[PDB]
Swiss-Prot record:
This is 3-hydroxyanthranilate 3,4-dioxygenase. It comes from Cupriavidus metallidurans (strain ATCC 43123 / DSM 2839 / NBRC 102507 / CH34). Fe cation 2 binds at C125, C128, C162, C165. Fe cation 1 binds at H51, E57, H95. Homodimer.
């Protein structure tokens, strides 16, 4: 049986869910309980956290523009996601997506993580570049498992404190 339903028009789905593709929500998963996690992410959203995904991530920037702050080969880099761009990110490449434009929409496709395969979320010092805090997580649900992780970081000056130069990470903003 067609567990995930029949085909449907994508642009229409996006327009009908436009109020969810903006703060405070920002994103929407298309299908529930599937092996492929298919999400549409909108904007605006800026963030400071870097994601360490143990599996690949596919991006297709449908509307608007965005960029990914990355660490590549020990250096900070940027991959620009201009409207119409596609991109495949290898596992473990640290990335922090920035989505400045309202009304933007990006297709992001991931896989469910098997038991034991953990996601990491990291923050780095604006001053010296050292890792400030890393949390690893078994990701079952984005909505429940993720926000409190970000919240405890922002609320603790200890977690935000660089172990190399003592500068305290700004937390939420930058
Ligand atoms: N962490 C993460 C995983 C998959 C997609 C995004 C996105 O907002 O581009 C993201 O920020
Ligand atoms: Fe990610
Ligand atoms: Fe530092």
């Amino acid at each position: 049986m067609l567990t995930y339903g029949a085909p449907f028009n994508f642009p229409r789905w996006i327009d009908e869910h436009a109020h969810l593709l903006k703060p405070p929500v920002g994103n929407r998963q298309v299908w529930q309980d599937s092996d492929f996690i298919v999400t549409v992410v909108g904007g605006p959203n800026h963030r400071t956290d870097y994601h360490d995904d143990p599996l690949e991530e596919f991006f297709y920037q449908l509307r608007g523009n965005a960029y990914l702050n990355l660490w590549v080969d020990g250096r900070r880099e940027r991959a620009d996601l201009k409207e119409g761009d596609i991109f495949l990110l290898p596992p473990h490449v640290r990335h922090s997506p920035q989505r400045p434009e309202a009304g933007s929409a990006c297709l992001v496709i991931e896989r469910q993580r098997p038991a034991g395969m953990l996601d990491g979320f990291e923050w780095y010092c604006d001053a010296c570049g050292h890792l400030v805090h890393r949390v690893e997580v078994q990701l079952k649900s984005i909505v429940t498992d993720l926000p409190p992780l970000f919240e405890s970081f922002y609320a603790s000056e200890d977690k935000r404190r660089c172990p190399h130069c003592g500068q305290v990470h700004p937390g939420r903003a930058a």
